[PDB]
Amino acid sequence: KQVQTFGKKKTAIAVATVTKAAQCNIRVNGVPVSQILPETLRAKIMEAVNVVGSRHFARLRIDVTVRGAGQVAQAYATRQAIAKGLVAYYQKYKNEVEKAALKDKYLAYDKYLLIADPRRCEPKKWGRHSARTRFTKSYR
Amino acid sequence: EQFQHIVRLLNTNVEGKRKVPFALRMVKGVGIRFAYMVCKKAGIDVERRAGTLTAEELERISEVIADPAKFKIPDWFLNRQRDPKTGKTEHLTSAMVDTRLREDLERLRKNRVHRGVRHA
Amino acid sequence: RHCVICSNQKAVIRKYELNVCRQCFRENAANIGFSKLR
Amino acid sequence: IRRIGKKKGATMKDVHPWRWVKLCSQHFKQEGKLMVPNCTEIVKSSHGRERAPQNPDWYYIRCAAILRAVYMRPGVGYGGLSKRFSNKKNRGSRPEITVRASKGLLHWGCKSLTKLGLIEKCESSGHRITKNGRKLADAI
Amino acid sequence: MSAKAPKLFNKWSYENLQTTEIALSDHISKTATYVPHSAGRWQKKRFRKARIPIVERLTNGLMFKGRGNGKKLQAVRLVKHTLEIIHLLTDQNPLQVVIDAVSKGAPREDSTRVGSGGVVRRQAVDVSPMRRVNEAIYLMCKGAREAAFRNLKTLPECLADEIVNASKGSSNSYAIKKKDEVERVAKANR
Amino acid sequence: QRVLVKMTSRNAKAVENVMTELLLHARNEKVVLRGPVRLPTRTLKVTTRKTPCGNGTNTWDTYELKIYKRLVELRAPTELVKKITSFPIDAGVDVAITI
Amino acid sequence: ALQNAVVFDKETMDKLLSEVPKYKVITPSIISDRLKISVALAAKGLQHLCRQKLIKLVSCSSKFRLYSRV
RNA sequence: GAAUUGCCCAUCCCUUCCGCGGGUUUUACCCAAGGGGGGGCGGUAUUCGCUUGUAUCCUUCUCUGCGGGAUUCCUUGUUUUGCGCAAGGUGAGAUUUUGGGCAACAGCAGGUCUGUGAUGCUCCUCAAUGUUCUGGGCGACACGCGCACUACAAUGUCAGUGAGAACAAGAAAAACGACUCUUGUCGGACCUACUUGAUCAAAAGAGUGGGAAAACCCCGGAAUCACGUAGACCCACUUGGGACCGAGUAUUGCAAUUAUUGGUCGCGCAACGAGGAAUGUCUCGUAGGCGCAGCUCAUCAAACUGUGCCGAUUACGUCC
């Protein structure tokens, strides 16, 4: 039993491959979760899984391939694709009731879940550097 | 009794520090020369320079400084190389600085063109 | 370098993407298929 | 592949083969140690371990990334130009090790310039990292 | 289970906490997240900045003055240490000490220029709730940078010191002296 | 091997008349037609100072081209390819290839 | 006590042992805020005493660690 | 199939449901045994972005063209009916959807005659000043003089010298009538790969290999960042910063006269410690911080243009 979802935030896309387990501790890339070098980002990725059952619903084997932005945005993207995968699994193989329980509690707890946070970038324009602070003034 | 103590090495008092190479730079050298430190017979760091002729064996260091060509150690670290009136000179320190400079202080500063007059 | 649609060699030569149209400015000398929309 | 990032590759895959390799000699120690290892130093090459934080790691990179060498492998090299001429700092590398590190793999745990395992010795000998530290590890 | 309903920083508990003031209770909110690290949109509307705890707000306004400064993740590294320090010093949950310090370092009355005639005139002007919060935060964490600027040997510890002395009302703290001196003009002139 | 047809053009609505319409002739009629979705479209961006002198506000422009590369694939026509590439004549910079 | 000190001395180490358990919070900083030796090897000075249980380590980490009275 | 099958300091042991007997006077708490149920470490085992091997299948992740998607509903508020307003909601997204680009009329004695084969007249028209693959020089000079713009710092909120880890996006590129090839003609001035460049440096030499680019070796990587590996320095104008200054060498070129400069290694103990008055500009993925490419082109980017990364505080008001 499988589903495959994606995270998207900034220019990082994550790809969450779900393959049926009823145990497996969740991991990322080539480095699992206890060996993720930035402790802070590790903690972010934890709150995804930890909340809404620590290993009570989080029992699927979920590994990811995340590329396309710096370390921080990849960790964000990770959380998203994980929780997406759980939800979609509990949609197909299991009733809407269980999904509604899980989902509602995700939505509540400040990520939102649903949002890609799709605020990207600015263009550089004119005759001007970034958004305005110009060169610096001539007298007026 | 010691263990941060002044040191005469050009007959010039220079105070110790709790690191050997970093303090040694005041004697007319720099860190990148003092990768010779390993071969100067106290490669250890986090050591006083009041340790002269005790745990540093100062006389050893003072040979390396003067000629490192007696030792096997790479002579890519030499301060002067193939001077215009002599061969290589192994180091720049003390009065031996002034000697080379003076010869080319008259010649170099003659130069006329954009960058020439700036150097003059 | 040098230019082939003037002989001035000054008032700046474009050699980007193998074309000159800045010894005769491209705003005046268009129909190279370029457009500005953004 | 297998090596690096399965034991925490940053600091708990390094010290253990380091001890073992210095205790019984294996890798190159060729003169050139004193020379600049990383761009625009004002100091010596390092305080201690001039070319003994290097060798197994320089195998590891090429192992797991498959035949990154001499120009790609300095990809996971370093250089910031951390002192500079008062212009914007730029990346670099020093070629010195490239020669020596492509020599290396023909002995000890790798085979050739096409095949980068044998029994993958480093992995197997690193299975005792997790068990017990040799540094008084925090996490063990 | 055991991280579903339970909420920690990683050992610091939000059950203990109580809002110290009753003037403030909609601009001081409790944390549930395990790091104060931000990733959301934090402003879009006049009050949307008071939906979130003092912790997050503080850690973001902790330092500026970039040159290659590591911003948020770096700040969080100092947060951790400073919480442990405050804990063993007050012998009490560090979080609840922060709750107190933000309230008790804040100026609660002000006086402003608003007169005319070629001259200024001052009147007693009450500080609004969100302003008490914000102003307190900024002053405390301004103190920090100045303390380590060429001085002390301490890196996180100055933060812990300030937060302690602020909660005690002691005039060691950079925040406390401001509340004091401002109110000596704003309750001595109306 | 398998013959492919890449059509490179400045403009859309030249290439469109090639791919959609005139591949119908080769669709199962003489050879089999495997449609993918066309290759990424490059921009050639150039930046030109508006002012012909040093007094303005130092203004610039952004000029852009589209490069449409329309790829559709076939399964080994030989001698039939003559028909395929004689079909478009409808615009300049319509160029076609045979492997 | 005294302001400047590289030094390794009898006094240095003997003072150390008494002062370290006195405080409720021990960091490398505060021992050199007594100024007895520099912050530098004040670090090492605490480590190999904590190893022998004159102190309690708090953080699972070193450097920006802190300690307490054992 | 390589490889692992982690028992050398922890993942054969648990969870759920249930029944009985103990340690408890009671409560809290806890111990033992068995039944049912679920797999966990091996019935879920990894990852290789080439083992490019050997089998099978697909379009979630990609890509481009052409279409969907709200100023509607609701609060029954505000709205005298209207024009509309505010909050909340559905929702990817709340109003000029969002960011840019174009833009009326009247003009200025604005700038440009060194952009033009766009030009009035009248100057230069042959010891021509025009013009020159002509040579060399200037535009760049230095009483330490003022101003405009830029960049580096005075460090503990990369923090300074060391190491290792994970990880980014537009865009650039190629073709000489020069050789060879034939009845009508192919490869050399672009990059990057790989290996020698260490039985002994950097700079730098050369051979093999592919590309007209979604092919270029994974099309994309090393800075900001992460790190306690128990690194080093440690409250100093230093081990923080560079600017002057001398010696050597290689690279580029029609020609170098620090042109070279990604390099060695001196001087640093030369400045400067957040810097008077004054003054600049931005309300959100912005400011600030950081790096890369394009641009110009014998050669050099503190500049300019574009893409990406880390990413706030305050305000969301008034008109002084």
XYZ file of N, CA, C and O in Angstrom, chain B residues 4-120:
468
model
N 54.879 34.085 32.032
C 54.743 34.941 30.889
C 55.875 35.900 31.100
O 55.900 36.616 32.101
N 56.857 35.915 30.172
C 58.123 36.544 30.441
C 58.651 37.066 29.145
O 58.518 36.425 28.103
N 59.288 38.260 29.209
C 59.928 38.933 28.103
C 61.100 38.132 27.591
O 61.713 37.363 28.330
N 61.451 38.338 26.302
C 62.362 37.474 25.590
C 63.160 38.415 24.733
O 62.587 39.289 24.090
N 64.505 38.260 24.710
C 65.375 39.010 23.834
C 65.830 38.061 22.771
O 66.323 36.976 23.073
N 65.594 38.438 21.491
C 65.826 37.574 20.360
C 66.433 38.360 19.237
O 67.040 37.771 18.344
N 66.231 39.698 19.223
C 66.993 40.605 18.396
C 67.704 41.579 19.297
O 68.172 42.619 18.835
N 67.816 41.227 20.607
C 68.185 42.091 21.710
C 67.074 43.087 21.940
O 67.306 44.249 22.274
N 65.818 42.615 21.778
C 64.647 43.446 21.818
C 63.685 42.653 22.635
O 63.332 41.534 22.266
N 63.269 43.216 23.796
C 62.208 42.708 24.636
C 60.907 42.588 23.887
O 60.431 43.555 23.295
N 60.316 41.374 23.905
C 59.034 41.102 23.312
C 58.406 40.176 24.309
O 59.003 39.164 24.671
N 57.158 40.477 24.744
C 56.526 39.777 25.837
C 56.034 38.450 25.331
O 55.653 38.326 24.167
N 56.070 37.413 26.203
C 55.469 36.127 25.955
C 53.981 36.199 25.767
O 53.346 37.227 25.992
N 53.400 35.065 25.336
C 51.979 34.870 25.244
C 51.821 33.410 25.521
O 52.805 32.690 25.675
N 50.561 32.923 25.560
C 50.258 31.550 25.882
C 50.139 30.753 24.610
O 49.608 29.643 24.612
N 50.661 31.310 23.490
C 50.813 30.615 22.244
C 52.124 31.046 21.656
O 52.398 32.239 21.530
N 52.928 30.050 21.209
C 54.272 30.223 20.703
C 54.314 30.964 19.370
O 54.949 32.018 19.360
N 53.724 30.535 18.234
C 53.952 31.148 16.927
C 53.436 32.564 16.853
O 54.140 33.415 16.318
N 52.223 32.825 17.389
C 51.559 34.109 17.416
C 52.366 35.219 18.056
O 52.280 36.369 17.628
N 53.147 34.899 19.119
C 54.007 35.843 19.804
C 55.299 36.036 19.058
O 55.864 37.130 19.037
N 55.770 34.952 18.397
C 56.995 34.881 17.637
C 56.969 35.786 16.424
O 58.022 36.148 15.905
N 55.764 36.214 15.962
C 55.614 37.049 14.790
C 56.196 38.432 14.957
O 56.574 39.070 13.977
N 56.313 38.910 16.218
C 56.848 40.213 16.549
C 58.341 40.313 16.347
O 58.912 41.400 16.417
N 58.998 39.164 16.059
C 60.429 39.009 15.954
C 60.807 39.113 14.484
O 61.980 39.023 14.133
N 59.816 39.477 13.628
C 59.865 39.507 12.183
C 59.588 38.170 11.547
O 60.411 37.654 10.793
N 58.400 37.586 11.818
C 57.919 36.449 11.071
C 56.421 36.488 11.104
O 55.829 37.454 11.581
N 55.768 35.390 10.649
C 54.337 35.315 10.429
C 54.061 33.834 10.528
O 54.959 33.013 10.356
N 52.776 33.480 10.765
C 52.199 32.168 10.928
C 52.611 31.167 9.886
O 52.965 30.044 10.228
N 52.496 31.527 8.580
C 52.724 30.636 7.457
C 54.170 30.165 7.342
O 54.438 29.121 6.747
N 55.151 30.931 7.895
C 56.521 30.479 8.067
C 56.622 29.466 9.160
O 57.378 28.503 9.055
N 55.812 29.656 10.222
C 55.832 28.885 11.438
C 54.885 27.717 11.304
O 54.159 27.390 12.239
N 54.853 27.095 10.098
C 54.537 25.696 9.923
C 55.831 24.923 9.972
O 55.834 23.694 9.965
N 56.966 25.653 10.112
C 58.263 25.123 10.448
C 58.288 24.753 11.906
O 59.164 23.996 12.305
N 57.319 25.261 12.716
C 57.139 25.025 14.135
C 57.228 23.573 14.532
O 57.865 23.232 15.528
N 56.609 22.684 13.717
C 56.615 21.243 13.856
C 58.025 20.673 13.888
O 58.322 19.763 14.660
N 58.914 21.220 13.027
C 60.291 20.818 12.854
C 61.265 21.678 13.631
O 62.475 21.512 13.487
N 60.774 22.604 14.490
C 61.609 23.518 15.245
C 61.896 22.939 16.607
O 62.578 23.574 17.412
N 61.410 21.698 16.869
C 61.624 20.930 18.077
C 60.900 21.557 19.239
O 61.435 21.693 20.337
N 59.672 22.030 18.939
C 58.569 22.083 19.852
C 57.445 22.416 18.927
O 57.195 23.581 18.627
N 56.822 21.358 18.354
C 55.649 21.470 17.519
C 54.389 21.690 18.295
O 53.356 22.014 17.710
N 54.466 21.582 19.644
C 53.350 21.756 20.539
C 52.915 23.199 20.534
O 53.721 24.112 20.352
N 51.590 23.401 20.670
C 50.965 24.694 20.740
C 50.153 24.640 21.998
O 50.005 23.578 22.604
N 49.616 25.811 22.426
C 49.033 26.036 23.735
C 50.124 25.867 24.765
O 50.079 24.993 25.629
N 51.192 26.673 24.595
C 52.363 26.626 25.418
C 52.804 28.049 25.558
O 52.705 28.837 24.620
N 53.308 28.397 26.766
C 53.933 29.654 27.105
C 55.120 29.940 26.219
O 55.704 29.026 25.640
N 55.419 31.237 25.988
C 56.759 31.651 25.663
C 57.334 32.378 26.846
O 57.638 33.569 26.806
N 57.446 31.637 27.967
C 58.483 31.831 28.947
C 59.253 30.538 29.008
O 60.086 30.340 29.892
N 59.037 29.657 27.998
C 59.426 28.271 28.012
C 60.740 28.101 27.317
O 61.149 26.975 27.049
N 61.427 29.227 27.006
C 62.671 29.285 26.276
C 63.762 28.534 27.004
O 63.988 28.759 28.192
N 64.431 27.596 26.280
C 65.477 26.717 26.770
C 65.006 25.878 27.934
O 65.712 25.744 28.932
N 63.770 25.329 27.842
C 63.224 24.490 28.879
C 62.374 23.463 28.191
O 62.694 22.275 28.227
N 61.235 23.897 27.599
C 60.321 23.031 26.896
C 60.184 23.452 25.460
O 59.483 22.790 24.696
N 60.908 24.517 25.038
C 60.858 24.999 23.679
C 62.157 24.653 23.025
O 62.174 24.315 21.841
N 63.261 24.640 23.817
C 64.626 24.625 23.338
C 64.891 25.704 22.318
O 64.960 25.432 21.122
N 65.055 26.959 22.799
C 65.073 28.180 22.025
C 66.117 28.175 20.936
O 65.842 28.600 19.818
N 67.354 27.726 21.258
C 68.474 27.621 20.346
C 68.169 26.899 19.044
O 68.629 27.331 17.990
N 67.365 25.807 19.090
C 66.796 25.081 17.967
C 66.031 25.961 17.015
O 66.286 25.958 15.812
N 65.057 26.733 17.560
C 64.178 27.636 16.848
C 65.003 28.686 16.140
O 64.811 28.928 14.951
N 65.971 29.295 16.864
C 66.865 30.317 16.371
C 67.804 29.877 15.263
O 68.400 30.725 14.604
N 68.018 28.548 15.074
C 68.710 28.025 13.915
C 67.822 28.001 12.703
O 68.237 28.466 11.647
N 66.593 27.438 12.824
C 65.577 27.403 11.784
C 65.285 28.758 11.172
O 65.216 28.885 9.951
N 65.097 29.800 12.027
C 64.924 31.196 11.658
C 66.013 31.688 10.732
O 65.724 32.319 9.716
N 67.289 31.364 11.041
C 68.427 31.948 10.377
C 68.658 31.258 9.059
O 68.727 31.919 8.025
N 68.784 29.911 9.076
C 68.866 29.110 7.880
C 67.940 27.930 8.068
O 68.194 27.116 8.957
N 66.884 27.757 7.276
C 66.073 26.554 7.285
C 66.555 25.649 6.178
O 65.894 24.647 5.911
N 67.689 25.988 5.518
C 68.206 25.243 4.396
C 69.195 24.213 4.867
O 69.570 23.321 4.109
N 69.609 24.291 6.157
C 70.379 23.269 6.831
C 69.497 22.082 7.105
O 69.920 20.932 7.002
N 68.238 22.379 7.498
C 67.159 21.442 7.665
C 66.605 21.078 6.310
O 66.895 21.731 5.309
N 65.827 19.971 6.251
C 65.254 19.442 5.031
C 64.032 20.206 4.585
O 63.596 20.064 3.443
N 63.474 21.047 5.488
C 62.164 21.652 5.413
C 62.014 22.535 4.184
O 63.003 23.143 3.774
N 60.845 22.575 3.523
C 60.637 23.225 2.235
C 60.984 24.689 2.250
O 60.485 25.418 3.103
N 61.846 25.111 1.300
C 62.292 26.472 1.144
C 61.446 27.119 0.080
O 61.951 27.662 -0.902
N 60.108 27.067 0.281
C 59.150 27.866 -0.441
C 58.666 28.943 0.488
O 57.892 29.810 0.086
N 59.165 28.937 1.749
C 58.696 29.807 2.798
C 59.655 30.954 2.956
O 59.438 31.820 3.802
N 60.737 31.003 2.135
C 61.748 32.033 2.212
C 61.175 33.378 1.867
O 60.331 33.497 0.979
N 61.620 34.416 2.605
C 61.059 35.744 2.536
C 61.566 36.460 1.308
O 60.808 37.167 0.644
N 62.861 36.256 0.969
C 63.476 36.763 -0.234
C 63.905 35.563 -1.019
O 64.284 34.538 -0.455
N 63.840 35.672 -2.363
C 64.244 34.618 -3.254
C 64.940 35.317 -4.377
O 64.407 36.278 -4.919
N 66.171 34.853 -4.711
C 66.989 35.207 -5.853
C 67.062 36.686 -6.149
O 66.686 37.145 -7.225
N 67.579 37.454 -5.164
C 67.789 38.890 -5.161
C 68.536 39.407 -6.386
O 69.151 38.609 -7.090
N 68.564 40.699 -6.709
C 69.051 41.126 -8.012
C 70.553 41.285 -7.982
O 71.127 41.458 -9.054
N 71.197 41.290 -6.787
C 72.630 41.442 -6.678
C 73.255 40.268 -5.973
O 74.481 40.197 -5.894
N 72.443 39.331 -5.424
C 72.940 38.154 -4.735
C 71.989 37.028 -5.054
O 71.021 37.206 -5.784
N 72.254 35.817 -4.508
C 71.343 34.694 -4.557
C 70.224 34.880 -3.566
O 69.935 35.994 -3.129
N 69.556 33.762 -3.184
C 68.528 33.732 -2.164
C 69.078 34.166 -0.830
O 70.241 33.915 -0.520
N 68.254 34.899 -0.048
C 68.516 35.143 1.350
C 67.309 34.599 2.050
O 66.179 34.796 1.610
N 67.535 33.865 3.161
C 66.585 32.921 3.690
C 65.479 33.565 4.482
O 64.440 32.944 4.699
N 65.664 34.829 4.919
C 64.765 35.414 5.874
C 64.909 36.902 5.772
O 65.857 37.400 5.170
N 63.929 37.638 6.342
C 63.985 39.065 6.527
C 63.751 39.273 7.992
O 62.717 38.875 8.527
N 64.744 39.895 8.670
C 64.659 40.239 10.066
C 65.676 41.330 10.277
O 66.606 41.468 9.484
N 65.475 42.157 11.337
C 66.414 43.125 11.872
C 67.006 44.065 10.837
O 66.268 44.723 10.106
N 68.355 44.183 10.795
C 69.087 45.078 9.934
C 69.167 44.554 8.524
O 69.329 45.331 7.586
N 69.061 43.214 8.352
C 69.093 42.529 7.078
C 67.962 42.915 6.155
O 68.088 42.772 4.941
N 66.814 43.385 6.710
C 65.780 44.119 6.001
C 66.349 45.243 5.160
O 66.334 45.166 3.933
N 66.876 46.292 5.839
C 67.343 47.551 5.292
C 68.280 47.447 4.116
O 68.182 48.250 3.191
N 69.209 46.452 4.135
C 70.239 46.233 3.135
C 69.701 46.179 1.722
O 70.138 46.948 0.866
N 68.708 45.287 1.473
C 68.135 45.039 0.172
C 67.379 46.233 -0.327
O 67.594 46.670 -1.457
N 66.529 46.813 0.561
C 65.624 47.906 0.281
C 66.309 49.068 -0.378
O 65.885 49.489 -1.447
N 67.398 49.576 0.256
C 68.160 50.749 -0.125
C 68.626 50.760 -1.557
O 68.537 51.794 -2.219
N 69.104 49.600 -2.071
C 69.553 49.420 -3.437
C 68.483 49.787 -4.435
O 68.741 50.487 -5.414
N 67.257 49.269 -4.196
C 66.116 49.465 -5.049
C 65.284 50.654 -4.651
O 64.312 50.957 -5.336
N 65.668 51.423 -3.598
C 64.938 52.615 -3.213
C 65.347 53.740 -4.117
O 64.588 54.683 -4.321
N 66.585 53.679 -4.658
C 67.048 54.660 -5.597
C 66.575 54.333 -6.985
O 66.137 55.235 -7.693
N 66.656 53.045 -7.409
C 66.277 52.624 -8.742
C 64.796 52.671 -9.037
O 64.387 53.346 -9.979
N 63.959 51.979 -8.220
C 62.522 51.831 -8.402
C 61.780 53.134 -8.555
O 60.966 53.300 -9.461
N 62.049 54.082 -7.627
C 61.394 55.366 -7.511
C 61.676 56.317 -8.653
O 61.028 57.357 -8.756
N 62.626 55.983 -9.564
C 62.888 56.750 -10.764
C 61.724 56.703 -11.722
O 61.475 57.695 -12.401
N 60.959 55.575 -11.739
C 60.089 55.156 -12.826
C 59.010 56.165 -13.125
O 58.455 56.785 -12.218
N 58.717 56.349 -14.435
C 57.870 57.406 -14.924
C 56.903 56.785 -15.879
O 57.326 56.120 -16.822
N 55.591 57.005 -15.603
C 54.403 56.446 -16.227
C 53.421 56.475 -15.070
O 53.800 56.888 -13.974
N 52.134 56.086 -15.285
C 51.016 56.167 -14.358
C 51.340 55.676 -12.964
O 51.360 56.459 -12.017
N 51.665 54.368 -12.832
C 51.845 53.679 -11.573
C 53.220 53.945 -11.033
O 53.444 53.832 -9.830
N 54.179 54.296 -11.925
C 55.562 54.546 -11.596
C 55.696 55.694 -10.643
O 56.269 55.539 -9.568
N 55.147 56.872 -11.019
C 55.127 58.063 -10.197
C 54.375 57.911 -8.885
O 54.704 58.596 -7.918
N 53.312 57.060 -8.832
C 52.630 56.695 -7.602
C 53.512 55.971 -6.613
O 53.425 56.222 -5.412
N 54.368 55.033 -7.099
C 55.352 54.346 -6.286
C 56.472 55.262 -5.850
O 57.147 54.990 -4.859
N 56.657 56.392 -6.571
C 57.672 57.376 -6.298
C 57.120 58.459 -5.357
O 55.969 58.321 -4.863
